[PDB]
Amino acid sequence: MALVQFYIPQEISRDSAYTLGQLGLVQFRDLNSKVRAFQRTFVNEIRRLDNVERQYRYFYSLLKKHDIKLYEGDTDKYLDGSGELYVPPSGSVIDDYVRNASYLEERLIQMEDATDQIEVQKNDLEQYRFILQSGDEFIAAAIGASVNYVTGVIARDKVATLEQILWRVLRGNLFFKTVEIEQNAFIVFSHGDLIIKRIRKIAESLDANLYDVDSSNEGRSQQLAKVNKNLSDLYTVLKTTSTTLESELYAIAKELDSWFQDVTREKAIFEILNKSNYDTNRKILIAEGWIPRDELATLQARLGEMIARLGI
Amino acid sequence: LTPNQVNDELNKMQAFIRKEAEEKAKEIQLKADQEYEIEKTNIVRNETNNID
Amino acid sequence: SQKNGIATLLQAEKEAHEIVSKARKYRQDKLKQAKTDAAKEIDSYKIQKDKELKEF
Amino acid sequence: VEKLLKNNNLINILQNIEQMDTCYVCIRLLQELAVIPEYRDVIWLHEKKFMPTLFKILQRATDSQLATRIVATNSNHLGIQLQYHSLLLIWLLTFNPVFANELVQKYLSDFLDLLKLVKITIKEKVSRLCISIILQCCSTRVKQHKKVIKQLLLLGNALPTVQSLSERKYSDEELRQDISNLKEILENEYQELTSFDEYVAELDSKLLCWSPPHVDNGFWSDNIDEFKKDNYKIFRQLIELLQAKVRNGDVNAKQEKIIIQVALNDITHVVELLPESIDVLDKTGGKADIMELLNHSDSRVKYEALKATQAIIGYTFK
């Protein structure tokens, strides 16, 4: 049958024993935190407890990102339908369960950072596509650096008004101001090539994206052809990421839950054993008993008010 | 449970305790035989080369 | 026989420790012997060399 | 002893796994003999007769659960002894330097199994033995000790598995010692190879594999500078190799699959560090290759490929 483990103080030893008794538990022997090697204090268990809290953390990290809600379910027994299936009758193999969860956390962090890097780059280039298009076409000089244009997006035509007054007072009428309503507002100021920095200060201070060229893909002539090919690479690269995100969501949502319930039982196993010194001077008794295999289920369901179990 | 049953549990437990301690002590002294020979081999080789 | 048995088990773990320690002392000694019997092993090979000089 | 090993009736009696009683005693008879030095040499001669069976006993343990009290090779008192005795027999031949080099090289596939036992067991009789034997073979005194570690580590992925095992530890001092000692030795030997020798050596052989110091951020930062003499000739060699293997001989073909995932990783690290490497990808045509891997079958191909493209993209347009 399965070896079973109990812990208490010696105050309710008798009241616990009686109740243990009634569930067909056999060969109940009271022991101490020393005699069985597993149930002996080690620094090793203080680390092991930490490895389980790192798994717990990981579950939260993963659950947030996938957009799959918080899981509570809280089993450690085989009586329950999901408790039996998602928590194995055999004891813990700590090295393994950590090793499954560690890798996935790592692969997940790399993916997520990359997804974020792709998403901002794509949304900006698709936006400045149109802008550069307008400003170049408005030509035969703005495929070079002969005339200066300042393309830019602004989200208030009101603040643009304020900039026209400023520009005019201190920088004269060297601006030609054109505007189109976009999906933002496309503003354009057009200027000399030796006052370039002076207009920029003003633009910066009221917050606009007035740059002389708003994309860095430039390197084919005209600029817009490179920008369009880069944006074809961007668009599919986010998609591919999503496909990867999905594959990982299908494999591990159920698994996540099954680890979560496992871990509950492992936090319990280290406390039982006495995981550290605090635990020792709080629960001086650790007891031994044998529970038949079918019965093993109703036993871990039982949790007294101080008693927690591990079965093998 | 009762005095026959707790003593039957005792007999089993010390049987495992004692056995495990015997195996653990056996592996330490078995490695001891070996470590004596490898170390003796190395020390002897270095010196025989100086002598030679 | 409950608290007579607990006493036997606390003792058994102490004994388990001691059995292991006895082997742990033996291991350390066997290492010291390796150096001494290797030192004795070299003054028997130095006369094996001297033998074949005198023979020559 | 030498004669009995060669003779059929006795060796057959060890071979039987259909009667536990004969096999248990037999492994211990031999093992009691291996303890005595002279006998190891004779025993080693007959090695390819009992040795796969001793691994088979551990293999059955791995593949079966550890909650059975019915006499077997599991959790059961018999089981704990049975693995122990097979493991002591191995541990005994591995103490000879010569025998240890040979063992890793012949039994290589079986040798890795030892990592599996250390893990699945709760029992310190088994765990200690497994780690000790591996230590014995990686030792300085073993002939061509650099090779045995290199092959275990690179192919068999010894270093990640050891790291993970380090967390689990139980009683008996020599056990904690053996893990700590192993961790250290594996880490040191791989690392001490030059970063430039390592990359170049893979590049020529047309066999590329991951290992932890290989993918290290430091290794890459020193190595960027080295590649330049032709507008990053090493990097370019890598791009050309990757380009060839996708087209020729396909992708998601076993051999071809290894080189790819490694290459896409290796270029990602370079690409990120310095943005002058962006030009060599566009020039060669290798940029086009990366895009096709995105939709190519397997998690690793698309994964590695997505990470490779996203890096190139970032420097194209920030």
XYZ file of C-alpha atoms in Angstrom:
738
model
C 0.000 0.000 0.000
C 0.765 3.680 0.146
C 3.042 5.144 2.845
C 1.227 8.136 4.448
C 2.544 11.122 6.495
C 0.894 13.174 9.241
C 1.982 16.103 11.305
C 0.668 17.817 14.491
C 1.747 18.781 17.914
C 1.339 16.303 20.813
C -1.616 18.182 22.250
C -4.228 16.824 19.792
C -2.182 13.612 19.208
C -5.036 11.576 20.725
C -7.903 13.393 18.980
C -6.034 13.128 15.700
C -5.204 9.320 16.252
C -8.853 8.466 16.970
C -9.994 10.235 13.774
C -7.142 8.636 11.776
C -8.408 5.329 13.229
C -11.976 5.682 11.952
C -10.844 5.877 8.232
C -9.418 2.406 8.321
C -5.798 3.799 8.736
C -3.431 1.009 10.062
C -0.057 0.587 11.808
C -0.159 4.168 13.178
C 3.106 4.853 14.895
C 3.981 8.290 16.256
C 7.605 9.351 15.352
C 9.955 12.416 15.480
C 11.517 14.937 12.959
C 14.819 13.042 12.694
C 14.261 9.266 12.520
C 13.160 9.064 8.827
C 15.887 10.639 6.567
C 13.348 12.352 4.264
C 11.631 14.031 7.192
C 14.922 15.365 8.529
C 15.888 19.049 8.272
C 18.137 20.088 5.402
C 19.097 23.388 3.656
C 18.383 21.397 0.582
C 14.525 21.684 1.420
C 14.698 25.433 2.004
C 15.896 25.673 -1.658
C 13.323 23.152 -2.831
C 10.605 25.266 -1.247
C 12.004 28.261 -3.204
C 11.935 26.233 -6.474
C 8.199 25.689 -5.894
C 7.482 29.369 -5.306
C 9.453 30.083 -8.606
C 7.084 27.597 -10.303
C 4.021 29.375 -8.743
C 5.322 32.812 -9.996
C 5.802 31.280 -13.422
C 2.244 30.131 -13.574
C 1.001 33.674 -12.947
C 3.493 35.074 -15.572
C 2.274 32.578 -18.140
C -1.474 32.989 -17.352
C -1.369 36.810 -17.743
C 0.352 36.690 -21.103
C -1.869 34.037 -22.696
C -4.948 35.969 -21.630
C -6.345 32.866 -19.847
C -7.877 33.635 -16.379
C -6.642 32.792 -12.840
C -7.033 29.250 -11.764
C -8.036 28.034 -8.284
C -9.025 24.392 -7.956
C -6.980 23.207 -4.926
C -6.603 19.523 -4.802
C -3.937 17.166 -3.502
C -6.246 14.029 -3.381
C -7.618 11.432 -5.790
C -11.264 11.468 -4.597
C -12.106 14.428 -6.866
C -12.462 13.935 -10.555
C -9.833 16.547 -11.531
C -7.863 15.821 -8.398
C -7.267 12.207 -9.541
C -6.425 13.077 -13.101
C -4.443 16.250 -12.699
C -2.528 15.096 -9.536
C -0.723 11.663 -9.894
C -1.070 8.879 -7.177
C 2.778 8.496 -7.202
C 4.803 10.972 -5.219
C 6.715 14.057 -6.497
C 9.721 14.050 -8.692
C 10.820 17.524 -8.000
C 13.568 17.787 -10.439
C 11.261 16.943 -13.338
C 8.250 19.223 -12.656
C 10.545 22.177 -12.119
C 12.346 21.303 -15.371
C 9.143 21.392 -17.382
C 8.066 24.732 -16.119
C 11.490 26.517 -16.131
C 11.981 25.958 -19.915
C 8.587 27.200 -20.899
C 8.923 30.342 -18.731
C 12.211 31.030 -20.492
C 10.820 30.461 -24.055
C 7.795 32.537 -23.207
C 9.810 35.587 -22.063
C 11.866 35.610 -25.243
C 8.736 35.368 -27.467
C 6.932 38.107 -25.571
C 9.682 40.705 -25.776
C 10.006 40.012 -29.504
C 6.216 40.306 -30.089
C 6.311 43.770 -28.439
C 9.297 44.881 -30.509
C 7.503 43.800 -33.789
C 4.094 45.406 -32.802
C 5.439 48.983 -32.304
C 7.596 48.929 -35.381
C 4.813 47.767 -37.663
C 2.239 50.268 -36.282
C 4.685 53.256 -36.744
C 5.879 52.256 -40.329
C 2.278 51.647 -41.645
C 1.399 55.055 -40.189
C 4.415 56.938 -41.782
C 3.957 55.250 -45.012
C 1.185 57.598 -46.001
C 2.927 60.637 -44.548
C 6.172 60.327 -46.580
C 4.113 59.572 -49.593
C 2.303 62.874 -49.448
C 5.364 64.920 -48.537
C 7.634 63.383 -51.273
C 4.905 63.739 -53.935
C 4.324 67.438 -52.957
C 9.028 66.076 -55.713
C 12.256 66.018 -57.654
C 13.831 67.412 -54.429
C 12.425 65.367 -51.623
C 13.915 62.225 -52.918
C 17.171 64.083 -52.128
C 18.157 66.649 -49.496
C 18.007 69.851 -51.828
C 14.911 71.355 -50.264
C 13.976 70.644 -46.664
C 10.599 69.172 -45.707
C 9.513 68.306 -42.261
C 6.891 65.568 -42.419
C 5.126 64.850 -39.203
C 2.175 63.479 -37.383
C 0.274 65.541 -34.700
C -2.861 64.637 -32.812
C -4.090 68.268 -32.297
C -4.635 70.710 -35.125
C -5.039 73.133 -32.144
C -1.455 72.763 -31.058
C -0.441 73.052 -34.697
C -2.059 76.531 -34.714
C 0.147 77.534 -31.718
C 3.228 76.366 -33.633
C 2.297 78.491 -36.696
C 2.158 81.604 -34.398
C 5.550 80.773 -32.818
C 7.234 80.003 -36.119
C 6.084 83.241 -37.507
C 7.233 85.530 -34.691
C 10.807 84.321 -34.442
C 11.491 82.461 -37.707
C 9.481 84.615 -40.192
C 7.413 83.285 -43.172
C 9.630 80.606 -44.482
C 6.987 78.040 -43.560
C 4.461 76.995 -46.080
C 1.810 75.053 -44.008
C -0.236 72.405 -45.566
C -2.518 69.936 -43.590
C -4.514 66.781 -44.339
C -6.973 65.034 -41.988
C -5.872 61.488 -41.439
C -7.320 58.409 -39.801
C -3.929 61.770 -36.424
C -3.405 64.889 -38.510
C -0.710 65.055 -41.151
C 1.144 68.444 -40.735
C 3.795 69.722 -42.938
C 6.079 72.668 -42.514
C 8.557 73.357 -45.280
C 11.771 75.162 -44.681
C 15.362 76.044 -45.616
C 18.380 73.713 -45.052
C 20.269 76.019 -42.577
C 17.497 76.929 -40.143
C 16.551 73.125 -39.849
C 17.427 72.694 -36.107
C 15.673 75.992 -35.150
C 12.261 74.697 -36.360
C 12.864 71.380 -34.721
C 13.262 72.967 -31.152
C 9.846 74.554 -31.534
C 8.339 71.338 -32.856
C 9.880 69.233 -30.057
C 8.457 71.549 -27.371
C 4.932 71.233 -28.272
C 5.282 67.563 -29.110
C 5.039 66.590 -32.759
C 6.863 63.908 -34.797
C 8.147 66.500 -37.216
C 11.352 64.720 -38.582
C 12.892 65.455 -41.909
C 12.271 61.852 -42.894
C 10.053 59.717 -40.660
C 11.215 56.344 -41.928
C 14.778 54.947 -41.959
C 14.127 52.707 -44.903
C 15.449 55.071 -47.470
C 18.159 53.150 -49.095
C 16.373 52.449 -52.462
C 15.315 55.297 -54.706
C 12.494 56.498 -54.236
C 12.380 56.022 -50.371
C 8.855 54.664 -50.554
C 9.793 51.442 -52.322
C 12.105 50.264 -49.497
C 9.479 51.372 -46.864
C 6.757 49.182 -48.579
C 8.991 46.022 -48.621
C 9.950 46.388 -45.003
C 6.278 46.773 -44.076
C 5.525 43.444 -45.977
C 8.107 41.760 -43.768
C 6.713 43.402 -40.678
C 3.102 42.371 -41.249
C 3.809 38.594 -41.614
C 6.347 38.560 -38.797
C 3.625 39.585 -36.263
C 1.252 36.863 -37.680
C 3.957 34.073 -37.292
C 4.423 35.213 -33.690
C 0.708 34.871 -33.056
C 0.773 31.288 -34.452
C 3.566 30.458 -32.024
C 1.618 32.039 -29.138
C -1.418 29.910 -30.022
C 0.588 26.511 -30.174
C 1.913 27.236 -26.682
C -1.506 28.264 -25.359
C -3.045 24.866 -26.527
C -0.238 22.769 -25.046
C 0.067 24.231 -21.643
C -3.252 25.796 -20.491
C -4.409 22.416 -19.055
C -0.919 21.490 -18.016
C -0.717 24.898 -16.111
C -3.710 23.973 -14.079
C -2.328 20.469 -13.299
C 0.975 21.936 -12.119
C -0.870 24.498 -9.992
C -2.740 21.738 -8.067
C 0.593 19.654 -7.831
C 2.478 22.611 -6.379
C -0.204 23.114 -3.597
C 0.647 19.534 -2.465
C 4.477 20.162 -2.634
C 4.264 23.296 -0.412
C 2.477 21.003 1.933
C 5.137 18.174 1.578
C 7.969 20.548 2.657
C 6.014 21.870 5.678
C 5.160 18.202 6.772
C 8.796 17.197 6.538
C 9.694 20.373 8.304
C 11.222 22.506 5.633
C 13.219 24.886 7.832
C 13.809 25.616 11.505
C 10.473 27.576 12.076
C 8.527 24.633 10.983
C 10.447 22.388 13.380
C 9.550 24.437 16.507
C 5.886 24.651 15.568
C 5.173 21.000 14.699
C 7.392 18.705 16.885
C 5.396 15.627 15.970
C 5.494 13.783 12.575
C 3.613 10.362 12.510
C 3.546 7.395 10.187
C 0.762 5.177 8.978
C -0.322 3.027 6.148
C -3.399 3.706 4.118
C -4.764 1.119 1.643
C -4.611 2.265 -1.981
C -8.352 2.846 -2.640
C -8.788 4.617 0.684
C -5.775 6.919 -0.054
C -8.312 9.295 -1.815
C -10.638 10.003 1.108
C -7.622 10.556 3.397
C -6.060 13.608 1.679
C -9.542 15.168 1.376
C -9.504 15.116 5.117
C -7.271 17.944 6.260
C -8.267 18.158 9.952
C -7.390 21.731 11.045
C -3.548 21.067 11.381
C -3.047 17.760 9.488
C -1.792 17.632 5.841
C -0.792 14.501 4.014
C 1.492 13.262 1.254
C 0.751 9.768 -0.377
C 3.016 7.691 -2.601
C -2.726 0.768 16.571
C -2.607 -1.662 19.452
C 0.627 -2.932 21.078
C 1.102 -5.898 18.627
C 0.559 -3.658 15.498
C 2.908 -0.695 16.707
C 5.684 -3.201 17.479
C 5.186 -4.863 13.949
C 5.615 -1.341 12.471
C 8.735 -0.799 14.666
C 10.362 -4.029 13.421
C 9.912 -3.030 9.823
C 11.209 0.508 10.288
C 14.547 -0.401 12.061
C 15.023 -3.057 9.462
C 15.100 -0.429 6.702
C 17.123 2.035 8.888
C 19.844 -0.467 9.660
C 19.982 -1.914 6.166
C 20.345 1.577 4.576
C 23.164 2.518 7.043
C 24.948 -0.737 6.185
C 24.847 0.086 2.418
C 25.832 3.658 2.942
C 28.885 2.717 5.099
C 29.723 -0.055 2.594
C 29.966 2.395 -0.316
C 32.233 4.778 1.629
C 34.708 1.919 2.536
C 34.467 0.403 -0.936
C 35.546 3.804 -2.350
C 38.222 3.822 0.311
C 39.833 0.594 -1.051
C 39.877 2.106 -4.476
C 41.156 5.551 -3.569
C 44.031 3.917 -1.710
C 45.043 2.095 -4.861
C 44.759 4.968 -7.415
C 46.617 7.434 -5.136
C 49.362 4.830 -4.340
C 49.769 4.222 -8.115
C 50.248 7.875 -8.922
C 52.677 8.672 -6.006
C 54.770 5.512 -6.883
C 54.906 6.420 -10.596
C 56.241 9.973 -10.020
C 59.048 8.828 -7.725
C 60.045 5.851 -9.908
C 60.660 8.374 -12.693
C 62.965 10.461 -10.368
C 64.751 7.192 -9.295
C 65.079 5.963 -12.918
C 5.145 -0.155 23.981
C 4.661 3.147 22.087
C 7.160 5.312 23.970
C 9.559 2.318 24.353
C 9.622 2.049 20.553
C 10.262 5.779 19.919
C 13.342 5.462 22.090
C 14.597 2.526 19.993
C 14.141 4.635 16.715
C 15.953 7.794 17.977
C 18.823 5.509 18.921
C 18.709 3.781 15.471
C 19.179 7.047 13.591
C 22.048 7.891 15.982
C 23.494 4.493 15.179
C 22.982 5.008 11.497
C 25.057 8.194 11.801
C 27.808 6.367 13.700
C 27.968 3.359 11.361
C 28.524 5.952 8.493
C 31.093 7.874 10.487
C 33.054 4.674 11.234
C 33.413 4.182 7.467
C 34.175 7.923 7.018
C 37.130 7.685 9.488
C 38.356 4.479 7.687
C 38.319 6.236 4.285
C 40.516 9.139 5.653
C 42.996 6.627 7.137
C 43.204 4.557 3.890
C 44.245 7.772 2.155
C 47.202 8.296 4.659
C 48.283 4.682 4.103
C 48.441 5.362 0.342
C 51.200 7.843 0.890
C 53.086 5.790 3.502
C 53.009 2.422 1.652
C 54.057 4.350 -1.521
C 57.013 5.720 0.410
C 57.980 2.205 1.422
C 57.378 1.166 -2.122
C 60.095 3.563 -3.442
C 62.976 2.434 -1.050
C 62.297 -1.167 -2.353
C 62.614 -0.125 -5.949
C 65.826 1.958 -5.218
C 67.539 -1.264 -4.017
C 66.175 -3.162 -7.077
C 68.099 -0.539 -9.146
C 71.227 -0.777 -7.014
C 71.125 -4.633 -7.507
C 71.545 -4.261 -11.213
C 74.382 -1.841 -10.955
C 76.340 -4.193 -8.742
C 75.509 -7.064 -11.129
C 76.862 -4.988 -14.016
C 36.258 -16.099 -12.591
C 37.478 -15.614 -16.220
C 36.312 -19.015 -17.228
C 32.878 -18.684 -15.653
C 32.163 -15.484 -17.378
C 32.802 -17.147 -20.787
C 30.729 -20.218 -19.906
C 27.163 -20.235 -20.984
C 25.056 -21.692 -18.070
C 26.066 -18.970 -15.572
C 25.930 -16.027 -17.955
C 22.384 -17.217 -19.022
C 21.376 -17.265 -15.411
C 22.236 -13.382 -15.274
C 20.501 -12.905 -18.689
C 17.173 -14.223 -17.263
C 15.009 -11.336 -15.999
C 12.129 -13.896 -15.923
C 13.401 -15.193 -12.591
C 14.375 -12.386 -10.237
C 15.974 -14.709 -7.612
C 18.911 -16.022 -9.900
C 19.641 -12.648 -11.506
C 19.801 -10.767 -8.168
C 22.368 -13.132 -6.586
C 24.405 -13.393 -9.802
C 24.937 -9.674 -10.163
C 26.094 -9.544 -6.526
C 28.468 -12.626 -7.023
C 30.319 -10.885 -9.785
C 30.150 -7.523 -7.983
C 31.772 -9.039 -4.821
C 34.533 -10.260 -7.145
C 34.922 -6.760 -8.891
C 35.695 -5.258 -5.375
C 39.063 -7.163 -5.524
C 41.427 -5.436 -7.892
C 42.954 -8.175 -9.917
C 39.498 -9.479 -10.906
C 38.428 -6.093 -12.622
C 40.848 -6.720 -15.504
C 39.477 -10.180 -16.301
C 35.828 -9.097 -15.863
C 36.343 -6.116 -18.302
C 37.341 -8.576 -20.973
C 33.862 -10.223 -20.839
C 32.138 -6.730 -20.447
C 29.814 -6.955 -23.569
C 27.818 -9.854 -22.054
C 26.370 -8.824 -18.603
C 26.755 -4.958 -19.058
C 23.631 -4.131 -21.350
C 21.545 -6.345 -18.853
C 22.770 -4.149 -15.832
C 21.594 -1.036 -17.827
C 18.305 -2.919 -18.669
C 17.627 -3.374 -15.024
C 17.948 0.560 -14.550
C 15.933 1.092 -17.789
C 12.976 -0.951 -16.547
C 13.196 1.114 -13.321
C 12.947 4.366 -15.263
C 10.190 3.339 -17.592
C 8.073 1.797 -14.609
C 6.607 3.826 -11.621
C 7.991 4.054 -8.129
C 4.918 3.187 -6.035
C 4.875 -0.624 -6.385
C 5.515 -2.810 -3.327
C 5.177 -5.990 -5.386
C 8.787 -7.363 -5.961
C 10.317 -5.679 -8.853
C 13.132 -3.066 -9.406
C 10.914 -0.020 -8.056
C 10.422 1.507 -4.578
C 10.293 -1.987 -2.986
C 13.220 -2.898 -0.647
C 14.396 -5.529 -3.134
C 14.359 -2.847 -5.948
C 16.476 -0.392 -4.054
C 19.159 -3.192 -3.564
C 18.858 -4.497 -7.131
C 19.753 -1.174 -8.818
C 22.499 -0.643 -6.180
C 24.321 -3.877 -6.894
C 24.262 -3.314 -10.732
C 25.510 0.315 -10.184
C 28.420 -0.956 -7.727
C 29.530 -3.390 -10.508
C 29.840 -0.494 -13.069
C 31.408 1.890 -10.465
C 34.143 -0.755 -9.861
C 35.253 -1.025 -13.540
C 35.076 2.844 -13.950
C 37.729 3.354 -11.176
C 40.527 2.148 -13.637
C 41.411 5.214 -15.904
C 41.511 3.213 -19.053
C 38.284 1.380 -18.556
C 36.333 4.586 -17.785
C 37.286 6.256 -21.220
C 36.252 3.089 -23.007
C 32.984 2.831 -21.119
C 31.710 6.267 -22.150
C 32.726 5.676 -25.786
C 31.046 2.170 -26.191
C 27.995 2.551 -23.966
C 27.363 6.134 -24.843
C 23.583 5.797 -25.360
C 23.188 3.785 -22.109
C 25.696 6.178 -20.255
C 23.130 9.057 -20.605
C 20.511 6.889 -18.888
C 22.355 7.476 -15.623
C 21.047 11.203 -15.651
C 17.459 9.784 -15.868
C 17.857 7.557 -12.714
C 19.376 10.423 -10.557
C 16.136 12.289 -11.236
C 13.301 9.740 -11.031
C 14.536 8.105 -7.804
C 13.925 9.411 -4.299
C 16.396 6.695 -3.245
C 20.028 7.890 -2.286
C 21.482 4.396 -2.935
C 20.756 4.750 -6.613
C 21.484 8.546 -6.961
C 24.852 8.596 -5.311
C 26.095 5.678 -7.443
C 24.976 7.212 -10.757
C 26.700 10.616 -10.109
C 29.898 8.977 -8.785
C 30.377 6.865 -11.917
C 29.991 9.906 -14.184
C 32.611 11.724 -12.000
C 34.991 8.894 -12.214
C 34.901 9.007 -16.119
C 35.246 12.827 -16.371
C 38.304 12.741 -14.010
C 41.824 14.116 -14.983
C 43.447 10.716 -14.727
C 41.105 9.178 -17.408
C 42.852 9.168 -20.891
C 41.338 11.759 -23.332
C 39.100 12.998 -20.608
C 38.425 16.190 -22.694
C 36.517 14.058 -25.346
C 34.220 12.124 -23.021
C 32.960 15.383 -21.348
C 32.675 17.149 -24.751
C 30.421 14.379 -26.264
C 28.246 13.987 -23.085
C 27.794 17.716 -22.750
C 27.207 18.742 -26.425
C 25.215 15.720 -27.726
C 23.719 14.304 -24.684
C 23.048 17.615 -22.990
C 24.730 16.683 -19.759
C 25.273 20.199 -18.379
C 21.474 21.389 -18.313
C 20.419 18.013 -16.755
C 23.216 18.225 -14.027
C 22.191 21.715 -13.069
C 18.672 20.725 -12.510
C 19.667 17.605 -10.476
C 21.885 19.883 -8.127
C 18.601 21.048 -6.443
C 17.657 17.603 -5.321
C 20.096 16.305 -2.727
C 19.844 13.751 0.101
C 21.821 12.181 2.907
C 25.361 10.926 2.852
C 28.127 13.446 2.278
C 29.917 11.860 -0.590
C 26.693 12.406 -2.702
C 26.688 16.228 -2.198
C 30.384 16.214 -2.941
C 30.061 14.259 -6.222
C 27.289 16.642 -7.615
C 29.210 19.821 -6.763
C 32.421 18.413 -8.238
C 30.551 17.357 -11.418
C 28.838 20.665 -11.977
C 32.146 22.466 -11.753
C 34.113 20.151 -14.022
C 31.473 20.164 -16.857
C 31.234 24.028 -16.859
C 35.098 24.546 -16.831
C 36.047 22.150 -19.696
C 33.560 23.421 -22.247
C 34.266 27.098 -21.516
C 38.078 26.911 -21.771
C 38.009 26.383 -25.554
C 38.465 29.646 -27.475
C 35.220 31.317 -28.730
C 36.787 31.819 -32.192
C 38.075 28.144 -32.430
C 34.671 26.887 -31.408
C 32.648 28.687 -34.069
C 35.161 28.109 -36.840
C 35.448 24.397 -35.962
C 31.691 23.947 -36.301
C 31.674 25.976 -39.480
C 34.136 23.754 -41.287
C 32.699 20.406 -40.288
C 29.224 21.439 -41.383
C 27.926 20.134 -38.004
C 26.460 22.869 -35.745
C 24.997 22.149 -32.247
C 23.981 24.326 -29.199
C 25.721 24.267 -25.908
C 25.312 26.855 -23.157
C 28.599 28.910 -23.447
C 28.219 28.907 -27.280
C 24.976 31.039 -27.139
C 26.461 33.226 -24.229
C 26.134 37.026 -24.725
C 29.804 37.598 -23.912
C 31.113 35.027 -26.394
C 29.393 36.854 -29.242
C 30.571 40.453 -28.232
C 34.265 39.515 -28.390
C 33.804 37.516 -31.589
C 32.110 40.293 -33.735
C 35.427 42.088 -34.141
C 37.267 38.968 -35.265
C 35.069 38.127 -38.197
C 35.953 41.275 -40.184
C 38.640 41.030 -42.955
C 36.210 40.840 -45.872
C 33.114 42.781 -44.474
C 32.570 39.933 -41.828
C 33.817 36.828 -43.600
C 33.023 34.278 -40.813
C 29.464 35.593 -40.474
C 29.154 35.367 -44.276
C 30.429 31.792 -44.263
C 27.630 31.072 -41.758
C 25.003 32.810 -44.028
C 26.170 30.895 -47.137
C 26.014 27.456 -45.238
C 22.449 28.173 -43.975
C 21.428 29.270 -47.485
C 22.687 26.056 -49.059
C 21.039 23.593 -46.575
C 17.453 25.040 -46.937
C 17.516 24.625 -50.690
C 19.646 21.591 -51.026
C 18.522 18.570 -49.131
C 15.501 20.346 -47.728
C 14.681 21.531 -44.306
C 12.933 19.645 -41.665
C 15.164 16.777 -42.631
C 16.968 15.382 -39.608
C 20.647 16.340 -40.249
C 19.698 19.570 -41.996
C 17.391 20.519 -39.034
C 20.189 20.614 -36.530
C 22.419 22.975 -38.435
C 19.521 25.480 -39.049
C 18.239 26.056 -35.627
C 21.804 26.673 -34.380
C 22.586 29.012 -37.318
C 19.426 31.138 -36.857
C 20.248 31.470 -33.135
C 23.937 32.258 -33.758
C 23.214 34.941 -36.322
C 20.429 36.550 -33.925
C 23.117 37.265 -31.272
C 25.489 38.918 -33.844
C 22.757 40.889 -35.563
C 21.648 42.530 -32.260
C 25.196 43.504 -31.063
C 26.376 45.454 -34.183
C 24.113 46.653 -37.105
C 26.816 46.452 -39.738
C 26.086 42.711 -39.982
C 22.553 43.767 -41.469
C 24.208 44.362 -44.796
C 25.712 40.956 -45.200
C 22.229 39.321 -44.776
C 20.687 41.478 -47.525
C 23.724 41.028 -49.838
C 24.163 37.190 -49.897
C 20.384 36.574 -50.119
C 20.230 34.948 -46.730
C 17.488 37.553 -45.623
C 15.059 35.652 -48.022
C 15.858 32.346 -46.402
C 14.825 33.553 -42.997
C 11.340 34.449 -44.235
C 10.607 30.991 -45.648
C 11.541 29.265 -42.268
C 8.614 31.151 -40.547
C 5.969 28.912 -42.069
C 8.192 25.787 -42.258
C 7.016 22.935 -40.093
C 8.162 22.234 -36.358
C 8.034 24.554 -33.337
C 11.824 25.136 -33.375
C 12.115 26.179 -37.052
C 9.493 28.800 -36.984
C 10.542 29.896 -33.461
C 14.206 30.287 -34.261
C 13.271 31.879 -37.581
C 10.901 34.474 -36.003
C 13.597 35.491 -33.511
C 16.112 35.795 -36.374
C 13.865 38.057 -38.591
C 12.592 40.246 -35.752
C 16.232 41.141 -34.846
C 17.108 42.122 -38.471
C 13.916 44.158 -38.744
C 14.713 46.146 -35.557
C 17.861 47.646 -37.017
C 16.296 48.232 -40.438
C 13.650 50.601 -38.828
C 13.599 51.470 -35.120
